[PDB]
Write a protein that binds this DNA or RNA. Structure first.
Ligand SMILES: [Mg+2]
Ligand SMILES: [Mg+2]
Ligand SMILES: [Mg+2]
Length: 90
RNA sequence: AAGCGCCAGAACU
RNA sequence: GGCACCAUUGCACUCCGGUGCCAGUUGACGAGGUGGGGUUUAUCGAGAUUUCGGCGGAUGACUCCCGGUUGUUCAUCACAACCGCAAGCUUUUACUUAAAUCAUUAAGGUGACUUAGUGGACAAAGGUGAAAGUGUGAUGA
């Protein structure tokens, strides 16, 4: 069910990797400390983010609050990650 | 201190 | 990389779906070379991914020209090779710091890459000394 890492989609695909990476860090910093934000632009991974929190407590509040939030003209879609990330697992 | 200087093809961001 | 257009709403942790376009970055490593006029695809090695491809520069080669060596001192003249601040040809000999690639580890980059440093080597042609070997003729002292 719940996870340290959160899965975000429906992101604006037109925005470049690092700009998107640093703009997500601008909002999700309040919920807790972020370990890393993983963004790709490939066919299968575009418009998708993976914010890695240190506390699940933070990832829940981030999921609760930032659901449906218009980010770059497009509302966000947040779930928990299906499995734990490498930095969390190891 | 002239194999030296620029950069339509090409290739790699 | 970045603007668009088409496609994609997708659960990852070594990048990477197209085409059109406007910007990037790479695009020669060092030795050696200039009397004027033409003609032309301009010498020498090192590396190996492109130092490929197209474009200009140029001190190259061949040649005409003027100028001058060498062929036994010197003008005039044929010649024969040469040279443009050097100069017949042959052969050895001594100089003429090769750098890059490689390895490496920084620094600056979103990045392709960039600049710089360290260690370790290895050229070829040409030029310049030196030592033999060794190359003309008329007409004047
Ligand atoms: Mg060079
Ligand atoms: Mg040079
Ligand atoms: Mg090869």
């Amino acid at each position: 069910r719940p996870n340290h890492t959160i899965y975000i989609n429906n992101l604006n695909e037109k925005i470049k990797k690092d700009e998107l990476k640093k703009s997500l860090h601008a909002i999700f910093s309040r919920f807790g400390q972020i370990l890393d934000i993983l963004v790709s632009r490939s066919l299968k991974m575009r418009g998708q983010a993976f914010v890695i929190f240190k506390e699940v407590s933070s990832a829940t509040n981030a999921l609760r609050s930032m659901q449906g939030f218009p980010f770059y003209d497009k509302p966000m879609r947040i779930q928990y990650a299906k499995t734990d990330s490498d930095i969390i697992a190891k």
